Amino acid sequence: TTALVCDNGSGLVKAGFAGDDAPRAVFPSIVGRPRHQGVMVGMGQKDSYVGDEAQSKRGILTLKYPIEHGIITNWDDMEKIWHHTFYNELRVAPEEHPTLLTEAPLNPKANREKMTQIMFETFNVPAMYVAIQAVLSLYASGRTTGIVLDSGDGVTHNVPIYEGYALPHAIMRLDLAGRDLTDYLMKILTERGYSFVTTAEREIVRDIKEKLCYVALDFENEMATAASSSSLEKSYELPDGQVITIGNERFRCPETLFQPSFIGMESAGIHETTYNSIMKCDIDIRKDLYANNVLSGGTTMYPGIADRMQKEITALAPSTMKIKIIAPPERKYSVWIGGSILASLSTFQQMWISKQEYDEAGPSIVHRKCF
Amino acid sequence: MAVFGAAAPYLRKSEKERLEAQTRPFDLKKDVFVPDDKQEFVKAKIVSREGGKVTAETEYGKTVTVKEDQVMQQNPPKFDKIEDMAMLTFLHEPAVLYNLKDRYGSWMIYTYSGLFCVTVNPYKWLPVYTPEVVAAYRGKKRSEAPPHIFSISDNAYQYMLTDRENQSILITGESGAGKTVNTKRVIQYFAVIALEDQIIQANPALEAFGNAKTVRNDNSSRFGKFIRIHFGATGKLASADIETYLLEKSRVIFQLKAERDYHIFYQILSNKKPELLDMLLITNNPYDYAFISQGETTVASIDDAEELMATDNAFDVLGFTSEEKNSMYKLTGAIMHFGNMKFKLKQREEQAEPDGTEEADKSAYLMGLNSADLLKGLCHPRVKVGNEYVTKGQNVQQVIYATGALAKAVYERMFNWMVTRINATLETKQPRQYFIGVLDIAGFEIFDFNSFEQLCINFTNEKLQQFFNHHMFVLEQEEYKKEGIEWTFIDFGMDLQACIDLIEKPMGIMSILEEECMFPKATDMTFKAKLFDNHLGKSANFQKPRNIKGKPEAHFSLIHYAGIVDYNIIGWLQKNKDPLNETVVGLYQKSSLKLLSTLFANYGKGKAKKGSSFQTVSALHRENLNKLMTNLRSTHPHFVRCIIPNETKSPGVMDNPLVMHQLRCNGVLEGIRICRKGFPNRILYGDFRQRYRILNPASRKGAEKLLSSLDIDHNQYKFGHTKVFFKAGLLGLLEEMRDERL
Ligand SMILES: Nc1ncnc2c1ncn2[C@@H]1O[C@H](COP(=O)(O)OP(=O)(O)O)[C@@H](O)[C@H]1O
């Protein structure tokens, strides 16, 4: 038997089989419902589109994300997402496959409890397990120490690990991510004349962000460069023509990661929460952590983010340390890759939570040594 | 006794000479088998049993004392020279050694040993291979005719014809101990009873592409050759098929301190074909090429230049063109050019980039790809994530493992396709019914620096020996259900399967090795620690190593049927990795050569697609062994055991250590040991009477009266309805009471 590695994320579902080199199914975690009335009789419209289909019918739907910041807020939508993943994308029967699921640090406990209750009762999986995203990133990176910065789409977090032991008191979690960057980019494009308001235009703005945004190495110098030159402006082609041209908005959007006061948050940038997690860690492992700073997740994928973060952390740390930032090209899928590695490990086969254990001890079994 | 032509003496000595040799004094008390120093057990006499002191007077004039706990009787003279080792009155280890010793001194080659057929090769010509005995055997039975492989060949044939099933001949011996010519005479006999020339003609190709120098042999076979001889409905010769199994890939890359790579690279390195070297850019110096130079560079094995010529001749006389041999040679040269590639880490990153490009250019010009394109495909693989491709990163270790796996893959691919071409040449359109296959496999090799490859070999031989053991179990159950005497319903296989479960099963050695080469920062010490933490004491066969006579090193020891083997860990993680590079495989599919056929296509709804990185030599090997067992377990098997008498080509004189080594590593001793738990001495009632009636001179009542008046216990003999079963002690006691009766 083989296991299923479903990294449900928050804004992208990634599923596949344990032992693969990459996820087989990657689609947005979206549930769309029609908002107009529907006149053609006989074509038999359905009531909810889930996944990559909702992006095709995007023009006549209201797109909902069932998961807000790591946390699941709509359990019916999430059951639809999982059903679509199991049956219409992987085409497997979950009654005969263990399932490894992934979660961010410092979430509510009812999240995991309801997740496993659903997986055992609605889908009847034989076993299941919930892993932390950062640990799986560090598996897939081929390290055993290092401070991992996993910037997804709802949540950003640092998890310092040394020699296979994690330092829980030094785990930092920040609720600024790609979704807030998209909202800031909408709000900041509005000052050039373009307005995107609907949930179906949020997707167009997310595409603009992915395709044109980058991190400036020096924010003030890039601002002056954009104010004087015009060599920074790119054009983008909306899905109906009418090209839009954006200038300093390209590097002004992901700069919110380093100055979260742009969106009215009080906290510190990612370069500073990384350093603060390191300084919470014990003094004997800080050199290794400085040398093994691992990036993963979709929001770490801007051009120039590694160079920017190295410049910042280097200016912060003592001048006699080797700051080094590991940013693989397959960053976005690191959590899934590590999950596949972990579920294929042979030592792991007695760490699943079986159906018998669940029927014995209730959903509370999730927080036990079978974590 | 004239039916055996001129070979009659060598095939079987006359009854008259048997009786004239029977008359010989032998003391059953003080001529017992005795441990030795120069050998294991030597013929000697004891003066007396003085407490813990005895004195063995051997032939050499020595008078050593041995302990009363290591002495055991010698075979009686009235049962020496026995054709069937299973019928020996006393089944000991050196007993059978001396049996075969006197049989080869008396120049009797073949000897029955139960379900086996043992054959020590004679070094000079005998009339035993003349066609007269071949034709004249037709009509004689196995149970009566003296041992020979023609017997078991005919028995397999008639078994096929009566049961309408396939049979399997398992010839077991070392390359260079006569296996080739043994199989040759097998195929001759099969043709006689109704394409051998073609087999021998295409053989040098396999001898090249699947043989390499080990320490125990300079022409050792690595792949599991296996020839299927089909037939028709009328049991007449139809066609022949051949399959290759378990070809070791690690040799193409890593070679030990004392051994070489495959023969082909050296044969090409023979300058007698300068056109090959100047068309492949191969410099004469063998130290130049890193894949090969780590092994033994050159040895006095054979005339490698002449062997190159013999292979080229066999090629030109085989169905395939000259361009195809040219492509074969150039492909092997490309495999050779892979080893010298050089990679460095980048400026301020963890990415691999090539510094040397010349060997890259020339290997691409050979392979039929672009050099920049192949370098890009090695440094930056592209993988499929849903409906998009993203580039994967690699460092130097990863790209080197990928290069090694690519080379091993292309070599093994070319090999399998060459075997397909050979079989196509051999192929005849005659309808092919049930076949009788003959199998050539590596041996249970033991050394002082056993490694991963030797572990794989021993695992294979474990599966084979357990298979034979279960086969003999069912055969003994057949004998019992015939005789109407059915007892001891335990099988004989699980006692060996318990050792298999320590290699294949999850948390076994292979699974731990796979997990360890998957884990991030694993090392050999961590591998050893996990092996110990997970097996030590909690298992039955896994146990500590042993350091004897200052051996090199050993990290743990398993026990097999062939003895305790100490294995070494160093290098297993690095050598087990087999990450195949999918982008470069696609490049090969898009080549401008024959390569696109070898790599034709290689790497939802339920998919067992293990990734390219989650690939391990051990896992591929376990799969191949599984399918080989599935091919064999459908055929009724037969077993042939070949022993070298001495390392020197001088006949007559032998080497007892080499004999013991062959016996243990072969499993004849394990067969006799499985016998030793039941009643191995099995004789009918009539001859029993004619030989033991004078003890109580006068069929169940008289036999029972004699047995009760011979002080025999119940559990010591089993009363049958055609034969009454006795053990070693019973035979000894009946012998003694006969002797005092006379
Ligand atoms: N090339 C890119 N540049 C910038 N942002 C990107 C890029 N690719 C994806 N993203 C952002 O990453 C987010 C998705 O991150 P992901 O790794 O899928 O987290 P999750 O799996 O939890 O949704 C999206 O909101 C998208 O805006």
- DSSP string spanning B1-50? --TTTTTHHHH---HHHHHHHH-----TTTS-BEE-SSSSEE-EEES--B
Out of B570, B594, B610, pick the residue that ends a domain.
Answer: B570
Q: Are residues A12 and A71 in the same domain?
A: yes
B175 is an active site residue: yes
How many angstroms separate the CA atoms of B342 and B217, rounded?
A: 34
What backbone torsions phi and psi does residue B566 show, to the nearest 5 degrees?
A: -100, 125
From the CA of A303, how far away is ligand 1's center (Å)? 13
Is residue A31 within 8 Å of A117, Cβ to Cβ? no
Out of B537, B554, B570, pick the residue that ends a domain.
Answer: B570
Nearest alpha carbon, ligand 1 atom 9: A298
Q: Are residues A22 and A94 in the same domain?
A: yes
Which residue type occupies A280?
Answer: K
How many angstroms separate the CA atoms of A344 and A347, rounded?
A: 9
How many angstroms separate the CA atoms of A27 and A13, rounded?
A: 6
Residue B56 is assigned to a structural domain of this protein: no
Q: What share of chain A is helix, strand, coil (3-state, %, to 5)?
A: 40, 20, 40
Range of the domain at A310: 142-176+268-326
Q: How far is CA B607 from CA A5, A19, B201, B620, B734, in A?
A: 13, 10, 44, 17, 67
- CATH number, position B712: 3.30.70.1590
Which residue type occupies B100?
Answer: L
Nearest alpha carbon, ligand 1 atom 18: A12
Is residue B498 within 8 Å of B735, Cβ to Cβ? no
Dihedral of CA B600/B603/B604/B606: which sign? positive
Nearest-Å Rg of the Cα atoms of chain A is: 22
CA atoms within 13 A on the CB side of A262: 21
Distance from CA of B239 to the nearest CA of A (A): 41
Stated length of chain B: 742
| The two three-digit tokens of residue B721, written as one number | 């309805």
Contact across the interface for B390 and A330, Cβ inside 8 Å: yes
DSSP A313-330: HHHHS-TTS---EE--TT
How many angstroms separate the CA atoms of A135 and A172, rounded?
A: 14
Least Cα distance to B86 among B56, B111, B63 occurs for B111
Instruction: Return the axis-axis angle of helices B304-316 and B196-209, rounded to nearest 10°.
Output: 130
How many angstroms separate the CA atoms of B698 and B180, rounded?
A: 57
Is residue B418 within 8 Å of B207, Cβ to Cβ? no
Ligand 1 atom at minimal distance to the Cα of residue A178: 25
How many angstroms separate the CA atoms of B509 and B316, rounded?
A: 46
List the determination method: cryo-EM
How many angstroms separate the CA atoms of B90 and B79, rounded?
A: 10
Q: Are residues A286 and A357 in the same domain?
A: no
Contact across the interface for A26 and B387, Cβ inside 8 Å: yes
How many angstroms separate the CA atoms of B283 and B277, rounded?
A: 7
Instruction: Return the axis-axis angle of helices B396-426 and B196-209, rounded to nearest 10°.
Output: 170
Q: Which of B390, B518, B609 sits opposite A20 (nearest CB)?
A: B609
First to last CA, chain B: 31
What backbone torsions phi and psi does residue B740 show, to the nearest 5 degrees?
A: -75, -25
Q: How many domains does chain B have?
A: 3
| The two three-digit tokens of residue A331, written as one number | 């960053």
Q: Are residues A114 and A227 in the same domain?
A: no
Which residue type occupies B4?
Answer: F
Q: Are residues A99 and A230 in the same domain?
A: no
- CATH number, position B515: 1.20.58.530
For residue B429, give the 3-state DSSP assignment.
coil
Nearest-Å Rg of the Cα atoms of chain B is: 30
Is residue B214 within 8 Å of B420, Cβ to Cβ? no
Q: How many domains does chain A have?
A: 3
Residue B401 is assigned to a structural domain of this protein: no
For residue B93, give the 3-state DSSP assignment.
helix
Residue B150 is assigned to a structural domain of this protein: no
Neighbours of B626 (CB within 10 A): 11
Least Cα distance to A124 among A93, A164, A101 occurs for A93
Q: Are residues A71 and A216 in the same domain?
A: no
Q: Are residues A275 and A154 in the same domain?
A: yes
- CATH number, position A146: 3.30.420.40
DSSP B503-540: TSSTTSHHHHHHHHHHSTT--HHHHHHHHHHHHTTTSS
Q: How far is CA B114 from CA A370, B339, B478, in A?
A: 55, 50, 14
Q: Are residues A80 and A17 in the same domain?
A: yes
From the CA of A179, how far away is ligand 1's center (Å)? 9
Residue A24 is assigned to a structural domain of this protein: yes
How many angstroms separate the CA atoms of A152 and A301, rounded?
A: 10
What backbone torsions phi and psi does residue B136 show, to the nearest 5 degrees?
A: -80, -15
Instruction: Return the axis-axis angle of helices B685-692 and B700-708, rounded to nearest 10°.
Output: 50
Residue A37 is assigned to a structural domain of this protein: no
Is residue B90 within 8 Å of B613, Cβ to Cβ? no
Neighbours of B461 (CB within 10 A): 22
| The two three-digit tokens of residue B150, written as one number | 């023609």
Least Cα distance to B145 among B131, B160, B134 occurs for B134
- CATH number, position B334: 1.10.10.820
Out of B570, B603, B635, pick the residue that ends a domain.
Answer: B570
Which residue type occupies B32?
Answer: V
Neighbours of B350 (CB within 10 A): 16
Q: Are residues A169 and A283 in the same domain?
A: yes
Burial class (CB in 10 A: 0-12, 13-18, 19+), A201: middle
**Structural gaps in chain B: residues followed by a C–N separation over 2.5 Å:** 194, 603, 698
Among A72, A133, A153, A155, name the best residue to mutate to test ligand 1's pocket (greatest count of ligand atoms within 8 A of Cβ): A153
Q: Are residues A184 and A252 in the same domain?
A: yes
Is residue B724 within 8 Å of B709, Cβ to Cβ? no
| DSSP symbol at B439 | E
Q: Which residues pair with A149 in a beta bridge?
A: A158, A295
Spell out a b/e string for A237-255, using b for 16 or more CB atoms within 10 Å of the CB, else e.
Answer: eeeeeeebebbbbbbbbbb
For residue B637, give the 3-state DSSP assignment.
strand
How many angstroms separate the CA atoms of A348 and B637, rounded?
A: 41
Which residue type occupies B137?
Answer: Y
From the CA of A151, how far away is ligand 1's center (Å)? 8
| The two three-digit tokens of residue B724, written as one number | 């009454």
How many angstroms separate the CA atoms of A57 and A60, rounded?
A: 6
Stated length of chain A: 371
Is residue B307 within 8 Å of B383, Cβ to Cβ? no
Residue B703 is assigned to a structural domain of this protein: yes
Residue B506 is assigned to a structural domain of this protein: yes
For residue A184, give the 3-state DSSP assignment.
helix
Is residue B230 within 8 Å of B434, Cβ to Cβ? yes
* Residues 6 or more apart in contact with residue A353 via CB below 8 angstroms: A116, A127, A128, A129, A365, A366, A370
Q: Are residues A152 and A187 in the same domain?
A: no
First to last CA, chain A: 22
- Resolution reading in Å: 3.1
How many angstroms separate the CA atoms of B455 and B629, rounded?
A: 18
B379 neighbourhood in chain A, CB within 8 Å: none
Out of A237, A257, A277, pick the residue that ends a domain.
Answer: A257
Q: Are residues A193 and A282 in the same domain?
A: no
Q: How many CB pairs under 8 A join A and B?
A: 84
| The two three-digit tokens of residue B228, written as one number | 């299927």
| The two three-digit tokens of residue A19, written as one number | 């032992």
Q: Determine how β-strand A31-34 pairs with β-strand A353-354.
A: unpaired
Is residue B39 within 8 Å of B656, Cβ to Cβ? yes
Q: Which three-class secondary structure string do you get for A52-98?
A: CHHHHHHHHEEEECCECCCCECCHHHHHHHHHHHHHHHHCCCHHHCC
Is residue A102 within 8 Å of A8, Cβ to Cβ? yes
How many angstroms separate the CA atoms of B308 and B277, rounded?
A: 13
- CATH number, position A210: 3.90.640.10
How many angstroms separate the CA atoms of B358 and B362, rounded?
A: 6
Nearest alpha carbon, ligand 1 atom 17: A298
B295 is an active site residue: no
For residue B257, give the 3-state DSSP assignment.
coil
Range of the domain at B549: 452-570
Is residue A292 within 8 Å of A276, Cβ to Cβ? no
What backbone torsions phi and psi does residue B381 show, to the nearest 5 degrees?
A: -65, 150
Residue A216 is assigned to a structural domain of this protein: yes
